[PDB]
Structures are given as C-alpha cells and as structure tokens.
Amino acid sequence: PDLEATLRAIVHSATSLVDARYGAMAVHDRQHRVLHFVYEGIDEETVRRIGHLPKGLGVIGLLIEDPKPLRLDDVSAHPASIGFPPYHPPMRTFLGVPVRVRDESFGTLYLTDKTNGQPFSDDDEVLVQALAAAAGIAVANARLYQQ
Amino acid sequence: GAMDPDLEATLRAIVHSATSLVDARYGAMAVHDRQHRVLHFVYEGIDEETVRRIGHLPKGLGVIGLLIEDPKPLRLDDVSAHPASIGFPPYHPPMRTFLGVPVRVRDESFGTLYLTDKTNGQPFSDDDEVLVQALAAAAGIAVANARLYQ
Numbered sequence: 001p002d003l004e005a006t007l008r009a010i011v012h013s014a015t016s017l018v019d020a021r022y023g024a025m026a027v028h029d030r031q032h033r034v035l036h037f038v039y040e041g042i043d044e045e046t047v048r049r050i051g052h053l054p055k056g057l058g059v060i061g062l063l064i065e066d067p068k069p070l071r072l073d074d075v076s077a078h079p080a081s082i083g084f085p086p087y088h089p090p091m092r093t094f095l096g097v098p099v100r101v102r103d104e105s106f107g108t109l110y111l112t113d114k115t116n117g118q119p120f121s122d123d124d125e126v127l128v129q130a131l132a133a134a135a136g137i138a139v140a141n142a143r144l145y146q147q
Numbered sequence: 148g149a150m151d152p153d154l155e156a157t158l159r160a161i162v163h164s165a166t167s168l169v170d171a172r173y174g175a176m177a178v179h180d181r182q183h184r185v186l187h188f189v190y191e192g193i194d195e196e197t198v199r200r201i202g203h204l205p206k207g208l209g210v211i212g213l214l215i216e217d218p219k220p221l222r223l224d225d226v227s228a229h230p231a232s233i234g235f236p237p238y239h240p241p242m243r244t245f246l247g248v249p250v251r252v253r254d255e256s257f258g259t260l261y262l263t264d265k266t267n268g269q270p271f272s273d274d275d276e277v278l279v280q281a282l283a284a285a286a287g288i289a290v291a292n293a294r295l296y297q
C-alpha cells in the first residue's frame with residue numbers, strides 16, 4: 001504493498017508532469033538503510049543488468065545529509081557526485097528534493113533528463129516539492145501503522 | 148481546531164503549485180469530512196482586506212458542489228452562467244473561467260481543488276486539467292494519511 005503503491009503514484013506524477021525520462025524515490029531508515037526504492041522510466045532488462053540497488057551515495061547521499069532541493073544541469077559535474085554503476089542509463093540533468101514532514105526527513109524524490117535536454121526549472125522544483133510533501137505525510141503515517 | 152501543520156503546509160504548497168502552473172489568478176482547496184461538509188478552506192490570490200470584506204467562508208455551494216455530486220473534472224468558460232451557479236457573495240472578486248476537480252483517494256472523497264481566471268483570458272486547457280487532477284490526487288493522499296495519523 002500500500003505505501004509502495006502510493007509512493008509509485010507520486011513518482012509517476014512527478015516524472016510525467018515535469019516530463020522527465022526517469023524518476024525515483026528512495027526512502028531510508030534512520031541509519032540510512034533503504035526501505036523502499038520505487039522508480040520509473042527504466043526497463044526490467046536494464047534493471048537486471050545494473051544488479052544492485054542504490055545505497056544512497058553521492059548526490060543522493062548529499063540530499064540525505066542536507067535535505068533541501070538540488071537542481072543540476074549535469075549531475076556528474078557536482079563535487080559530491082559518486083558516478084553511475086556499470087549498465088546504468090546515462091543521466092545528466094537532475095532535480096532532487098526531500099520527502100519529509102517538519103519532525104523528520106525520510107527520503108528523496110528525484111528526477112533526471114527532462115525532455116529535449118532542458119534543465120529543470122524553478123516551476124519544476126516547486127511542483128516536485130509539493131508532491132514530495134504529500135509522500136512525506138504518507139511515510140509519516142506508515143511508520144505509525146508500523147507500529 | 149487548526150489543521151495539522153504538515154497537512155496545512157502540504158495543501159498550501161499544492162494550491163500554490165496548481166495556481167502558478169495553470170497560470171490562474173485564483174486557487175482554492177476545501178477539505179471536507181466524509182459527508183462532504185467543509186472543515187477547512189485554503190486559498191491564494193485574494194488580499195487580506197478583500198477577505199475581511201467578504202466576511203464569511205464558502206459552504207461549497209453552486210458549481211463547487213457539482214465537483215462532489217459528479218466527481219470528474221469540470222471546466223467552464225463562464226462559471227456564474229451555469230444553471231447550478233449560486234453566484235458570488237458581496238465583495239467577492241468576479242470570476243469567469245473555472246477548472247475544478249474532486250480531491251479523492253479511490254472512491255473516498257476528501258474535498259475539492261479549483262482555480263479561476265487563467266491570466267491570459269483563455270479557457271483552461273486539457274493540460275491544465277491533467278495537472279490539476281494529479282495535484283488533487285496528491286492532496287487526497289495527504290488528507291487521507293494526515294487523518295489516519297491524527
């Protein structure tokens with residue numbers, strides 16, 4: 001799943017409305033182990049080739065350490081960038097925001113490769129934040145349920 | 148009482164994004180109980196003095212009430228010309244174009260999200276409708292999960 005479905009719907013909305021090729025949300029525990037990783041834009045065969053799930057390093061690890069929106073023309077050019085694993089699709093433009101409530105941040109919603117090579121806009125960032133906020137309340141509630 | 152602070156921040160952000168992105172002059176969201184009764188109303192585009200002059204909050208009547216009766220998106224080019232229109236109260240800005248949608252999770256209803264007066268004098272678009280639907284769905288997720296949390 002129920003939370004996982006909800007998070008997938010939010011990822012779909014973010015990806016489709018901003019017109020990004022790829023979108024993902026990683027939800028972590030308080031020791032930064034990944035509890036949920038939902039994504040879209042990548043085929044199952046490519047997923048199988050990449051193999052291992054992301055641990056939340058590089059630019060995503062920064063977003064966990066310092067939860068605030070991060071918009072980049074080229075994710076690779078960022079000083080905190082760790083790089084992609086083998087077989088991962090190339091990705092350039094990046095927009096990432098925290099999935100949170102006032103008390104606590106739980107993860108990161110992030111998009112790459114806006115259509116036609118364009119950088120993500122102010123407007124995109126504001127939208128993705130609003131969507132992330134709804135996910136944040138859903139994660140907060142799931143953690144009450146559990147338990 | 149006041150809305151949950153995380154819920155309120157979230158709903159105001161969703162209203163702002165909707166209003167900004169469809170280029171509406173005015174945007175609003177009502178949060179309802181399970182019987183479609185308004186509990187909270189959030190808005191943007193109207194100054195504090197105008198709000199004081201209007202002096203009473205909306206009940207969810209007229210064309211707004213249709214968003215619940217018939218829960219699919221409603222676009223109109225002259226909202227107050229509609230036969231269901233109740234009209235604007237004294238001091239309320241006149242409004243013409245309208246795009247509104249129910250806020251729902253599955254079949255469960257949680258309120259309404261609606262925008263007026265697209266700033267280019269034009270009707271709201273298919274693309275506007277799609278965007279507002281998606282934001283309404285996000286608002287639904289927020290209300291449903293705040294509710295359960297509370």
Ligand code: HEM
Binds near residue numbers: 110
């Ligand atoms: C489709 C949505 C996806 C997006 C938007 C995305 C985005 C990114 C980005 C931007 C980086 C590099 C960050 C940096 O340089 O610091 C990265 C790294 C990485 N990605 Fe993806 N990715 C996606 C899907 C996947 C999938 C399906 C997998 C594997 C199942 C995966 C596995 C990894 C791994 C292992 C890293 C190395 C850093 C880490 O472990 O956190 N990614 N991803």
Ligand code: HEM
Binds near residue numbers: 190192199205262
């Ligand atoms: C800024 C965003 C707003 C929008 C888009 C909006 C839109 C509308 C529309 C389209 C109607 C007429 C519906 C019909 O004729 O059937 C209406 C009626 C009404 N409005 Fe607003 N309005 C907004 C803000 C406000 C505010 C801030 C107040 C009060 C402080 C208010 C009070 C009312 C009242 C009392 C009605 C009569 C119907 C009812 O009670 O539901 N409105 N509004």
Ligand SMILES: [Ca+2]
Binds near residue numbers: 167168170
């Ligand atoms: Ca615009």
